[PDB]
Amino acid sequence: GSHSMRYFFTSVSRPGRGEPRFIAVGYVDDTQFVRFDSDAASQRMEPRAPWIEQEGPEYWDGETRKVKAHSQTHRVDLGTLRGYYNQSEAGSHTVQRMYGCDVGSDWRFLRGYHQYAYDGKDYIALKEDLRSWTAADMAAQTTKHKWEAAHVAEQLRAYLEGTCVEWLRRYLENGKETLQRTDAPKTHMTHHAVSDHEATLRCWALSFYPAEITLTWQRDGEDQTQDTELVETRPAGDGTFQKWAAVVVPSGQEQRYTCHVQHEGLPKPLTLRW
Template identity: 25%
Template sequence: MQPPRCCCLLLLLYLFLLSGTWATLEGTFTVQLLQTSTFQNTSFVETEGLALLEDIEIATLDKHTRSIHFHQPWVHPALPHMDWDNIENMLRIYLLKISHLINEGAMEKDVPYPFVIQCRAGCELYPNRTSRTFAYVGYNGQDFLIFDSDNDTWTLSQDTDLSRYFLAYLKNHTAFSERVEVLFNNTCVDAMERFLTYGRAALERQELPVVTVFARTPSPQQLLLVCHVTAFYPRPISVAWLRDGQEVPPGPQLSTGPVLPNADLTYQLRSVLAVAPQDGHSYACRVRHRSLGTRSLLVPWGNSQLLLITALLAGLLGAAAVAALLLLAVWRRRKHQRVEESESRNSTLSKEA
């Protein structure tokens, strides 16, 4: 029996509207779930979970009730209530199974307690609507297992008794692997498309970078030029030093740190260039960022004190010019008043005579 034509048309219209809405967002997008489980002993496991869309915290998992708490107002309306119920149920089953599996392996392989298991899993959605899932498992901060999405298989990152036990279980118990695949593949991709629609404003948020250039002198023979860029969003940014208008190539004299988060959900970056004092070159820090469009921020260093003195002198000269004009106006007014008074006295004397 074929479905009614009206239902097919409505479905096509829904898919068209959904795809057309999120397709206006350019680039690759990632949803990832971060799980940290602390195994204190065989009977006590504490698990924390965080969900991210790009770098936006969208939800956390309550470690006591295993329920989802939403961090953005648009996250909960993005999916029907029934879908959230299904996701919570799948997460509870997954966490119960994975905790039981790890505890069994730890006891069988005499793994000492306490230890920490971390998992980072999710999906990437590309501009052409293709997707890729990923999953990484860590043990006490070290890589443990990796999911090969191209071959749908798990591989060892750390060859230990526990990792081999875990790998053998995943290969032998296909039902659990299929549940994980549904959670991190189909569910993840479907949910992301809705998040891209409802969270478009958050994803398109842009904050202009604030750039400061200053110098430090660790020794008389060395001058460190520092370009500090902060308050920008989104995260991708390009920072370069220019010497006499030409970009300084990578080398031991150039050190650019990682992009670090600020408390206000923006980012900061610092680039340091080592130069010889009074080497005769001009230097400038160039910043390119999405919020600037096709423009670049170019903040020069060098002759800063001269520029400051020039500005102060210009200000003083301007003030002196204004004062001179005021004095001239007062002098002219008083001269005009004296002339009028003199003419008035002469007129009075003439009348008396």
């Protein structure tokens, strides 16, 4: 199947409370493998998967240097950006940056991404072709102009099509037992009379990986899109995910309803009935 390597960066200015807070995290698919906290004691890039720990001192020195440079870059950006938006020095503001690559099932480049947000809003983003920028504001166009001038697109495209894909493959091999696994969902149903003339059917999927799953309720084969309560897929904390979907059904109609579970770890989609 397809895979992704993704880095997420958050910088939060805290006026009179110190240097901005900086948090970096890296994923391969739905597994975190690294982290940096500006407030942490190590002041290093740190492992958060066992398969990355086998990388040598060169890697960790290399990744600390680069992430410290990401942190500094955002420190300037925070100050620049408040200037661009004529904002005060006393308010706290947030810079977010995401970048990474997807590979298809053939393990060749599929997509690259680079997006940047000020105070939770699209600011500047690299376009699909990894050649051009999408600038939200006129301030973004000033960044757009800086970056076009410095040929950022070209430097970043090389990373996303090249280095990013190369390292994603190394991680998929080093972490083959964890990253190239599918944990099929453990499924069950519950029934709860919500009143005296209707009941709740809850369809459960537990211990699944990857996070991607489809839970649908049908009545006589007809999907019940607008009648389904559907929680956001959630982490178990052990590297697996959970989800449920619920319908409220008249008492006596239970058997008309089927839950359908679609997940990559399942040879066939599961049909579950009460």
